[PDB]
Amino acid sequence: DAEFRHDSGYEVHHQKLVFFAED
Ligand SMILES: [Cu+2]
């Protein structure tokens, strides 16, 4: 996501924590 821990570009692609991407 863009909010929980890192970055901006995606509601998925959660590379900082990898486990949740619930879109
Ligand atoms: Cu993310």
Residue whose structure tokens are 């995606």: 10
Ligand 1 centroid, distance to 23 Cα (angstroms): 11
Given a contact cutoff of 8 angstroms between Cβ atoms, the answer to whether 21 and 14 are in contact is yes
Determine the Cα–Cα distance for residues 14 and 7; give it in Å rounded to an integer: 9
* Centroid of ligand 1 to alpha carbon of 17 (angstroms): 7
Name 8's Cβ contacts closer than 8 Å, sequence gap at least 6: 2
**Alpha carbons 21 and 23: distance in angstroms, whole number:** 6
DSSP character string of 1-19: --SSSS-SS-SS--TTT-S
Instruction: Compute, in angstroms, the gap from residue 22 CA to the centroid of ligand 1.
Output: 10
Please, what's the b/e burial string for 1-23 (b: 16 or more CB within 10 A of its CB; e: otherwise)?
beeeeeeeeeeeebeeeeeeeee
Q: Are 2 and 10 in contact (CB under 8 A)?
A: yes
Q: Which experimental approach was used here?
A: NMR
